[PDB]
Amino acid sequence: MFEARLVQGSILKKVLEALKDLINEACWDISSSGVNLQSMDSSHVSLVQLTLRSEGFDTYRCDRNLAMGVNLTSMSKILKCAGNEDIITLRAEDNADTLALVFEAPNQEKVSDYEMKLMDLDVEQLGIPEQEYSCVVKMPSGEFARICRDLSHIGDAVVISCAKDGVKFSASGELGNGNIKLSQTSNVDKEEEAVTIEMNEPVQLTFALRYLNFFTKATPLSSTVTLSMSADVPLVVEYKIADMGHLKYYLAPKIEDEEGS
Amino acid sequence: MFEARLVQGSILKKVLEALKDLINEACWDISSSGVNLQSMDSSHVSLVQLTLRSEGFDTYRCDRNLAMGVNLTSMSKILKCAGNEDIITLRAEDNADTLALVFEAPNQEKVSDYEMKLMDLDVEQLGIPEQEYSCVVKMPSGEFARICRDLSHIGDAVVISCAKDGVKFSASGELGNGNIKLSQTSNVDKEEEAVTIEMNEPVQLTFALRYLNFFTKATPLSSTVTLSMSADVPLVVEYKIADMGHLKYYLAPKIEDEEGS
Amino acid sequence: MFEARLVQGSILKKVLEALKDLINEACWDISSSGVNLQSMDSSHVSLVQLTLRSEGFDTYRCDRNLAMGVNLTSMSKILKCAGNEDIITLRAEDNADTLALVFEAPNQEKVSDYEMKLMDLDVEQLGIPEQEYSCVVKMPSGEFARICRDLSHIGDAVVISCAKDGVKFSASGELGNGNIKLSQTSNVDKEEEAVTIEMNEPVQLTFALRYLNFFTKATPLSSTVTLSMSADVPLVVEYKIADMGHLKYYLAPKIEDEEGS
Amino acid sequence: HPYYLRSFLVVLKTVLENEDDMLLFDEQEKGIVTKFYQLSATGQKLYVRLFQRKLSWIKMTKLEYEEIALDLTPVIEELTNAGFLQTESELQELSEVLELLSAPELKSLAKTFHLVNPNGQKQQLVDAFLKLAKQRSVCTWGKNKPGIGAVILKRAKALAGQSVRICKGPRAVFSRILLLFSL
DNA sequence: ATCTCGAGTCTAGAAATTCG
DNA sequence: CGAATTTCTAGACTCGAGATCAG
């Protein structure tokens, strides 16, 4: 029987909000290591991964590895009902088909108990080979969200072309063409304002802006996006879930020949 | 000649906001003791009442008993145009079909004079028979509103179990079922925190959640909401309008056989 | 070539927000004196004037007079993407083919570059005359916006009449008739929170509420709005653009039909 | 005579000719067709069209038959008293009224009664409305028997307006002749 | 050949969350 | 704590889907 007690319900609320508009069914792989997820999107373009180490949960216990097919929209709707400071207590028992969420108010005056209905999903595993990237940038999440939102109004395909002084989030469209450019900073006391870029080889790619706008819904999770890209390799957008895990988004770069026609 | 000078316009604004989304027309009964509204709902299942007393009004004068049919939507639209610090001065001439609203200002530099066209309504007199109630529950209005809003997502019917260990709501739908329970308050002396429950006989009923959501629109009126119900009698939801009166709602419990279909 | 460096981008943002819902295409008569814009609206009922003196800009260089016919909706769309603390650097080459915007940031760490496609338009210059006015009223912009918004809920015919001690805005719809009177006060030291009326002869006019609601979109530009009118002369609504220039709105009075007969 | 009528009159003529046809019909079955004959040319043609249409309620505003009469109301009364037609006065079933209403009209009624999904399809609204008639009421009408569906009926009938339907009696009896012609 | 209809699709305005 | 913002929702728009038909 599986029981997890997470003190910070805001983390789960934000995760479910981030995943609600991109994935509808997921295969929650639960092991002794911790909660895991891997389910490429319904449009079959973008891949999403999630990890939650067991050390993060205040109380964790699991005997046998499981596999839960949960409707993400229903889970998001259920989690929206929970408050911002409750203690989520996910629990599944034996071989039932019910997910039992329990929310406890901090003042022990209101205990909410909810129950779900599991569904069977085919366990499809997609290989994730580790490799080395060319352009790796660590930069504030709010800046990335603002850049994507601003460029969504002009065009629909950014051209990330990491340059000598910094990134070059250019675009194009019928209205015109916006060439945004942040300047590299190193002498910053805090790490929330670092825009450090590490290069080995030059890079220049193309991506769909709708998928980037979908990706940036996970801004509240952290404040340091870690865009890592290289030649003919899917882009990796990674956030740090406090000290619990990471939420990586995979997006294959668009083909320049597609824009020709 | 009717002339009522009410210093707090916010009370009237809140009352009209509460009554605007549930009621279209009402019989604005007036007398020498204060406004006594008693109107209907279109679906013919919920009954509302209002008992604005006379001592609360700063100045009151009423020569003869009057009955007015005022379009509630129109009155709500007119009241929305007034700020939350004006001095409403409802006044109606004898058989003139005009409800001359007058809004003053705290800085006496801008006054507003309005007029409305009265309507002819078939005054149906209903005599509410007073009766004893088994379960009497009073709790903060915010908690009740949040509970109803949370349970609206899951299902549509709420099974209130007025148990002596703590009121326990329950709703079951296609997405699952979720039950929320509270606990009695013993040490908190604040009136906006007590969850005191009164018992004479255990009860268990079922009501439509849409009507409860409509009822909870009067939350800003007062912090404490009183619930009274018994076996096979309508539920009474009562809000106290300061020292000026009260606002009661009525709802017909669902039949158990209705859930069979 | 034309280059204008404006420290306060919020002024341009507010101006474009004001002009976006009333005028679609306009001609910017650029000269050494400053920026000019006269363009009757699409419905050909109201006229909009604008002037920004060259001394207002931090840096200004205009060798020759041009006429940039640009799309107002697209300009508003681009300008919305800029922050409220940027340093806009509108630029255009002597070969009039494109408009460049060089949005910056206060931290000189992120710059934005944009381009636009100009259009060729028939510059129909209308020479407005300079006439005196009978009733001139200056009063806070917030009060005017609130009055227009409140009256829009009743009818579509405002009957202004400078009464003995202030204005007498009067609407008359099917629901009722609402009279609003402002008390003339001048003893207040704060001239922003003052209403001053100067009479030369009595006047009573009529106007359309939709156009007044459209006009009131320029509220954040300035706190005080000046109204001037006379017999059979269009109403003048003037907003002072800080210390740079002014933004005038024109509206021909409604023709009072022989409804009494 | 309009084209559909003479071919229609042919059916009655030959059937009334052969002596074996009326042997399966009783006296009142021969009397109802007799009442058809004594109807006027205007009255007879009106019953022709509604025979070929599906058996359902039809709004009065939806018949535009300029070839017979610009104003059909005097003609409808002629069939109304004869028993060939029935008017909305006999329309008492809730289900019949709800399907009679148009798609946008039903949506407006749903908004007034605060339905769960006011912007659903026509079929989902009808069952919800029919289900709503089974709910209880409050002291608003006392409590002897809910009868809330009666409240819906009066509101729905006013929305629907005037309507008529072919009476089954004349319909069933008159449907019994055209088939034996096909043999 | 004639006709109505309902159903999916897209905007602009009202309401809830948040930042200042 | 009001204004601005984003998001959710009512309303109008365009088009596929019945119903009838004539032989």
Side-chain angles (χ1 to χ4, degrees):
Chain A
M1 85 59 57
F2 161 54
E3 160 199 7
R5 172 171 161 82
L6 166 56
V7 175
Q8 293 244 319
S10 65
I11 291 164
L12 259 173
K13 279 177 63 81
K14 291 152 193 171
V15 163
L16 255 291
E17 144 201 299
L19 294 190
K20 80 156 214 312
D21 42 13
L22 200 63
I23 297 163
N24 272 24
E25 287 98 327
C27 206
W28 292 73
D29 169 33
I30 279 81
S31 80
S32 162
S33 76
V35 173
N36 191 336
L37 200 149
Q38 163 154 10
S39 73
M40 71 96 78
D41 68 332
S42 306
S43 153
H44 283 265
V45 175
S46 69
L47 176 97
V48 174
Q49 192 200 355
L50 213 168
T51 313
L52 283 136
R53 282 169 297 262
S54 60
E55 79 216 337
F57 291 88
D58 212 312
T59 294
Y60 205 100
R61 65 143 282 180
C62 167
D63 314 333
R64 164 201 51 270
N65 315 337
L66 314 180
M68 279 83 103
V70 189
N71 196 323
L72 267 282
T73 319
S74 312
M75 216 172 171
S76 161
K77 257 185 304 309
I78 273 183
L79 260 303
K80 161 220 67 52
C81 302
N84 266 332
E85 58 272 3
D86 306 60
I87 320 172
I88 321 293
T89 324
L90 324 169
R91 164 211 323 273
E93 164 67 89
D94 178 359
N95 207 327
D97 62 320
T98 54
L99 205 40
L101 303 102
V102 171
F103 316 145
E104 312 168 352
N107 59 354
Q108 326 75 329
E109 293 290 340
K110 173 177 171 187
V111 181
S112 306
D113 180 294
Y114 293 60
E115 169 171 313
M116 226 158 179
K117 27 173 56 171
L118 269 46
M119 77 186 37
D120 195 1
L121 259 281
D122 51 83
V123 178
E124 273 184 2
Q125 204 287 331
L126 299 130
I128 314 297
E130 293 77 16
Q131 43 204 290
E132 288 320 280
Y133 299 94
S134 307
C135 193
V136 281
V137 294
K138 315 179 45 209
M139 69 168 240
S141 55
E143 225 65 25
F144 199 40
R146 174 181 320 310
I147 288 318
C148 287
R149 182 189 65 93
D150 286 354
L151 280 204
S152 284
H153 300 135
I154 289 300
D156 281 73
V158 314
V159 180
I160 300 144
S161 53
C162 327
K164 142 67 211 69
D165 211 21
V167 317
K168 197 166 290 318
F169 277 93
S170 154
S172 172
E174 36 87 15
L175 282 192
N177 43 17
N179 316 336
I180 320 196
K181 164 214 171 92
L182 299 93
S183 312
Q184 179 174 340
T185 88
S186 54
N187 37 286
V188 183
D189 58 328
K190 73 206 74 62
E191 291 335 283
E192 202 260 354
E193 210 60 32
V195 68
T196 307
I197 170 175
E198 181 265 282
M199 227 75 181
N200 51 65
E201 262 48 62
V203 74
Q204 161 169 6
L205 308 171
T206 307
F207 308 88
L209 251 181
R210 205 178 77 262
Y211 286 121
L212 283 196
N213 280 337
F214 283 156
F215 293 173
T216 44
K217 295 305 210 257
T219 300
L221 286 170
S222 176
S223 55
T224 39
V225 181
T226 322
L227 248 64
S228 308
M229 81 215 88
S230 166
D232 36 359
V233 153
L235 168 83
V236 158
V237 194
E238 147 172 349
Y239 303 70
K240 284 302 296 315
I241 306 299
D243 174 3
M244 271 205 308
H246 50 82
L247 171 71
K248 297 176 178 178
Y249 294 64
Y250 285 65
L251 180 58
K254 294 303 136 283
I255 312 172
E256 263 178 355
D257 274 347
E258 271 172 354
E259 270 168 350
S261 73
Chain B
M1 150 154 193
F2 190 25
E3 163 185 2
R5 164 189 198 73
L6 167 57
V7 183
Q8 285 54 1
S10 61
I11 284 171
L12 249 180
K13 285 179 63 77
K14 292 154 191 173
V15 164
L16 270 283
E17 171 46 3
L19 295 191
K20 93 144 185 301
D21 40 17
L22 193 71
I23 292 175
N24 42 67
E25 321 305 307
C27 198
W28 222 271
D29 190 351
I30 316 290
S31 156
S32 43
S33 98
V35 187
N36 287 256
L37 204 149
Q38 168 150 20
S39 86
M40 258 316 324
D41 163 14
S42 322
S43 97
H44 229 302
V45 80
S46 83
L47 153 68
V48 191
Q49 188 205 311
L50 172 54
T51 323
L52 301 166
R53 245 186 320 281
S54 154
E55 279 84 304
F57 290 103
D58 199 290
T59 313
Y60 205 91
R61 145 164 195 288
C62 176
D63 298 331
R64 305 171 302 104
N65 318 340
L66 322 173
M68 322 195 168
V70 193
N71 194 317
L72 256 297
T73 309
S74 310
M75 192 145 158
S76 167
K77 292 288 278 306
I78 282 187
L79 264 305
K80 164 220 64 53
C81 303
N84 42 335
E85 50 269 0
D86 310 41
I87 305 174
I88 322 286
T89 323
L90 301 203
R91 161 202 290 102
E93 216 38 79
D94 50 345
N95 57 273
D97 313 65
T98 41
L99 201 42
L101 292 98
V102 163
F103 314 148
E104 269 136 7
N107 43 25
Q108 47 294 24
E109 42 81 25
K110 163 186 168 187
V111 315
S112 320
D113 171 24
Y114 286 65
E115 274 203 11
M116 215 174 338
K117 294 170 184 173
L118 272 63
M119 299 183 6
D120 201 356
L121 262 284
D122 40 359
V123 185
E124 285 172 354
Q125 193 303 339
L126 319 89
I128 310 161
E130 298 83 351
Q131 42 212 302
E132 189 268 351
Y133 287 86
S134 312
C135 162
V136 156
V137 164
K138 50 188 315 298
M139 64 223 179
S141 49
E143 281 198 5
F144 178 50
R146 194 140 41 62
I147 280 170
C148 283
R149 199 199 66 201
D150 286 350
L151 284 195
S152 277
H153 308 289
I154 297 307
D156 192 88
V158 52
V159 184
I160 300 182
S161 301
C162 187
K164 220 170 179 178
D165 198 23
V167 53
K168 170 177 158 182
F169 303 75
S170 308
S172 173
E174 80 298 331
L175 281 201
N177 39 27
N179 49 351
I180 307 166
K181 64 190 307 307
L182 317 182
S183 38
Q184 297 82 297
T185 291
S186 309
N187 53 336
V188 187
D189 50 349
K190 316 302 297 307
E191 287 333 290
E192 47 268 61
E193 259 319 298
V195 197
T196 282
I197 176 175
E198 172 57 87
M199 258 309 132
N200 200 11
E201 283 92 3
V203 296
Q204 150 152 19
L205 308 107
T206 302
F207 313 92
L209 266 183
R210 155 191 65 259
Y211 286 106
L212 288 195
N213 284 160
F214 281 155
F215 285 2
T216 48
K217 290 280 183 179
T219 292
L221 250 181
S222 178
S223 64
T224 69
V225 52
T226 296
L227 274 84
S228 315
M229 71 205 158
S230 197
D232 210 337
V233 287
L235 167 90
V236 164
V237 193
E238 159 166 356
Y239 299 82
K240 205 72 81 202
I241 303 185
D243 59 335
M244 226 173 47
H246 62 257
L247 185 71
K248 296 182 177 183
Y249 299 81
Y250 292 80
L251 188 61
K254 263 188 172 180
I255 317 174
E256 280 184 3
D257 274 346
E258 287 151 349
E259 288 158 355
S261 306
Chain C
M1 61 76 88
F2 160 59
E3 166 190 10
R5 169 168 159 81
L6 187 41
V7 181
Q8 273 327 74
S10 60
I11 288 170
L12 261 172
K13 285 176 60 78
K14 293 152 191 176
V15 161
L16 261 282
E17 160 63 24
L19 293 199
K20 80 165 187 178
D21 42 15
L22 194 55
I23 293 165
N24 279 336
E25 323 306 317
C27 198
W28 309 60
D29 297 320
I30 304 280
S31 69
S32 163
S33 69
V35 180
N36 193 332
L37 189 146
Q38 338 185 4
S39 61
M40 183 191 298
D41 79 319
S42 95
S43 58
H44 281 261
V45 188
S46 78
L47 170 158
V48 170
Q49 214 269 9
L50 202 155
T51 301
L52 298 178
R53 263 162 307 118
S54 60
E55 291 96 16
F57 302 102
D58 208 288
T59 314
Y60 197 86
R61 277 203 28 260
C62 161
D63 297 334
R64 337 176 310 94
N65 318 338
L66 319 88
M68 276 138 277
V70 317
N71 197 321
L72 262 290
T73 312
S74 308
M75 181 145 298
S76 157
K77 187 70 59 60
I78 273 180
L79 258 295
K80 178 228 49 77
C81 300
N84 44 22
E85 45 170 33
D86 317 333
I87 323 180
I88 313 191
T89 279
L90 290 163
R91 195 201 273 95
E93 194 41 58
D94 221 17
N95 172 222
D97 44 17
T98 37
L99 206 41
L101 300 96
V102 166
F103 303 169
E104 296 199 23
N107 61 356
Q108 47 296 355
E109 289 290 348
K110 157 187 166 185
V111 315
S112 311
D113 170 27
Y114 293 75
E115 254 201 9
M116 225 156 164
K117 297 171 187 170
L118 327 177
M119 331 185 298
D120 206 358
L121 281 161
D122 193 297
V123 199
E124 288 174 3
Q125 195 290 319
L126 319 89
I128 57 185
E130 297 81 18
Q131 338 173 193
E132 87 296 328
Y133 296 93
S134 312
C135 183
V136 277
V137 170
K138 54 181 318 294
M139 41 156 278
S141 151
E143 285 306 317
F144 192 61
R146 176 160 320 121
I147 282 174
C148 284
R149 209 270 324 284
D150 290 353
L151 287 192
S152 273
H153 295 297
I154 298 311
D156 268 43
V158 168
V159 181
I160 314 192
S161 289
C162 319
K164 167 60 215 66
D165 60 334
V167 287
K168 253 194 50 56
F169 301 115
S170 317
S172 166
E174 50 85 36
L175 209 36
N177 35 287
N179 305 30
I180 299 173
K181 174 191 304 307
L182 293 183
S183 312
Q184 163 194 2
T185 171
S186 325
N187 48 86
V188 174
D189 46 74
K190 296 152 300 313
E191 331 288 349
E192 48 270 66
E193 242 292 335
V195 50
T196 290
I197 175 175
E198 196 274 341
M199 225 53 176
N200 190 25
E201 249 188 1
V203 63
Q204 148 151 0
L205 306 181
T206 321
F207 303 97
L209 255 181
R210 204 166 60 90
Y211 280 145
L212 289 201
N213 283 158
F214 280 144
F215 290 1
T216 47
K217 295 295 182 185
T219 280
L221 280 171
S222 183
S223 63
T224 75
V225 52
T226 301
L227 283 102
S228 310
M229 60 219 160
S230 194
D232 311 67
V233 165
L235 165 87
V236 155
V237 183
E238 155 168 356
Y239 286 68
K240 223 58 154 172
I241 300 295
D243 43 332
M244 269 183 338
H246 60 80
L247 171 76
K248 294 184 177 183
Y249 283 40
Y250 282 34
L251 171 61
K254 252 194 164 183
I255 303 172
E256 265 179 354
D257 281 338
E258 267 180 358
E259 271 170 354
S261 325
Chain D
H1 298 37
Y3 64 97
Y4 41 56
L5 171 150
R6 324 80 51 91
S7 302
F8 191 166
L9 283 180
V10 165
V11 171
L12 282 313
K13 178 182 270 271
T14 88
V15 168
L16 289 177
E17 275 164 358
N18 163 274
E19 303 161 0
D20 214 337
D21 302 332
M22 41 299 300
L23 294 174
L24 316 175
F25 288 167
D26 82 345
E27 72 290 342
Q28 61 54 19
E29 283 149 338
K30 311 313 296 191
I32 170 148
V33 50
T34 325
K35 308 146 190 143
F36 189 162
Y37 282 120
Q38 63 214 80
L39 304 173
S40 73
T42 325
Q44 290 184 7
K45 293 174 198 181
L46 185 43
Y47 186 49
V48 170
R49 304 321 271 291
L50 291 43
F51 200 16
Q52 293 324 81
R53 200 81 193 171
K54 69 223 65 172
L55 181 68
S56 87
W57 286 98
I58 164 176
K59 293 190 182 175
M60 218 55 33
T61 88
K62 305 312 291 168
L63 320 90
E64 301 84 25
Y65 284 175
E66 56 304 350
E67 79 290 345
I68 177 64
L70 270 283
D71 185 25
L72 296 174
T73 79
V75 200
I76 304 146
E77 307 139 12
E78 178 184 6
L79 291 316
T80 313
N81 41 68
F84 294 140
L85 251 53
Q86 63 185 12
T87 206
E88 82 284 1
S89 64
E90 300 178 34
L91 175 59
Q92 303 323 90
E93 275 298 326
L94 174 56
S95 61
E96 301 180 4
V97 192
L98 298 171
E99 53 89 11
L100 179 61
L101 293 176
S102 68
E105 283 165 330
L106 209 77
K107 186 173 123 105
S108 36
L109 200 73
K111 204 153 296 319
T112 313
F113 285 76
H114 311 304
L115 262 290
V116 180
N117 157 9
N119 43 6
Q121 296 171 358
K122 176 182 174 174
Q123 173 34 50
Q124 316 146 24
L125 286 169
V126 164
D127 56 68
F129 261 109
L130 189 32
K131 183 48 71 194
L132 179 59
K134 290 179 202 25
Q135 315 335 328
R136 212 202 283 207
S137 90
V138 83
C139 289
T140 177
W141 215 7
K143 32 215 163 172
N144 45 55
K145 201 52 65 199
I148 172 184
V151 184
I152 329 180
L153 183 65
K154 33 162 276 282
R155 275 294 281 281
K157 280 181 74 171
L159 269 283
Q162 232 301 339
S163 296
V164 291
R165 174 152 54 67
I166 289 281
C167 288
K168 298 180 175 144
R171 158 57 72 72
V173 74
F174 204 108
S175 296
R176 266 205 147 195
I177 313 99
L178 60 175
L179 56 166
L180 58 59
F181 204 109
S182 69
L183 289 304

